């Protein structure tokens, strides 16, 4: 279990998320470490889901190969027959070092981001309910009348809201609005491509049992090629809603896959929001679990016994 990364100056430490602790290589180059921690109700629990981060890298590094042929994406090509560890300094190699890194470490070209968190949904619940039931709309998109609660959308419809620079929040946005932001056929060929690989993973998943209700993309533009580029983490449970397929239920609330058990014991003792507070035991084995299940599902590999 990783809760925090400590390279000893080793490599330059550039920020740590919630999850991911990232370091720079080069000067286009990123090594993204995700840990073990959660979060809830914008908060970071203070123990661990051993293994998370190991379980949502290898979980990003099969949808980057599943869209490979459909987008280009960050990942740095590693040469046959070496590793990670063959691309940074040699003392990463050390046992010490080595525990903290392998299984839970992408190594990533930089790239320029399109300023846009780009969202997809297919299926309406979250704010995009929440919206609809008062004004009929979505960002500002009309809906068709008579959805019920966590519904499928006709199609998956892209919902962008601003990507936010450090000291202020999201603010959600129509298409028209991201078009003005970053230019119209820059947003328009954004859109398709987003609801593109939404569509492909969301078909995939639902086939293997897991309903994706919507996810949160990001993307890089080559200046050079005009090729845009998938960046960030793909499709996990931590940028995704991820549904059960088995319980799900039109007109009602659903379940978070991962999550439930550990809002539900965090809601039961009124501490959402508190920080500094530690799951107990059976919180974190069920809450493990699930991304192990999550994992093999999707993936189709065993994890172990
Ligand atoms: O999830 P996070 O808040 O830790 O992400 C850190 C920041 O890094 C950006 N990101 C993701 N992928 C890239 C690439 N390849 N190049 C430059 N920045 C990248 C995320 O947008 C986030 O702001
Ligand atoms: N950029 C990278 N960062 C971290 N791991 C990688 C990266 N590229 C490939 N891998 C992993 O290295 C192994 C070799 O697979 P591949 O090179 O895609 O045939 C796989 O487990 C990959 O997921
Ligand atoms: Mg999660």
Redesign the pocket.
Same mark, same amino acid.
């Given at each position: 279990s990783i809760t925090k990364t400590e390279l000893d100056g080793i490599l330059p430490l550039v920020?740590r998320?919630?999850?991911?602790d &990232?370091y720079e290589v080069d000067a286009g180059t @990123?090594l993204?470490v995700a840990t073990d921690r959660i979060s809830a109700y914008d908060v970071i629990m203070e123990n661990s889901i051993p293994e998370k981060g190991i379980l949502l890298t290898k979980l990003s590094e099969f949808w980057f190969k599943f869209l490979s042929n459909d987008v280009r994406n $960050?990942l740095v090509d590693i040469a046959p027959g070496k590793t990670i560890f063959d691309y940074l300094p040699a003392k990463l190699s050390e046992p010490k070092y080595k525990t903290q890194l392998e299984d839970r470490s992408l190594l990533? $070209?930089? $790239?320029k @981001?399109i300023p846009l968190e780009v969202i997809v949904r297919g299926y309406i619940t979250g704010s995009a309910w929440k919206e609809y039931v008062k004004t009929g709309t979505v960002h500002g998109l009309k809906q068709p009348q008579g959805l019920k609660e966590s519904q499928e959308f006709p199609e998956p419809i892209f919902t962008p809201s601003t990507?936010a620079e450090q000291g202020e929040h999201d603010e959600n946005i129509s298409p028209a609005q991201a078009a003005e932001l970053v230019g119209e056929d820059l947003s328009r060929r954004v859109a398709e491509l987003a609801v593109k690989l939404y569509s492909k993973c969301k078909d995939y998943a639902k086939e293997k049992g897991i309903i994706i209700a919507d996810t949160k993309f990001?993307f890089?533009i080559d200046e050079k090629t005009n090729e845009i &580029?998938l960046?960030?983490?793909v499709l996990t449970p931590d940028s995704s809603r991820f549904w059960n397929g088995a319980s799900y239920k039109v007109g009602e609330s659903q379940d978070s896959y991962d999550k439930q058990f550990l809002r539900d014991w965090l809601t039961a003792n009124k501490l959402n929001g508190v920080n500094g507070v530690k799951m107990p035991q059976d919180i974190v084995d069920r809450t493990r679990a699930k991304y192990i299940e999550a994992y093999e599902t999707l993936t189709g590999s065993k994890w172990s016994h």
């Open positions: 920020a998320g919630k999850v991911r &990232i @990123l993204f $960050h990533v $070209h930089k $790239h @981001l990507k990001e890089g &580029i960046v960030d983490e």
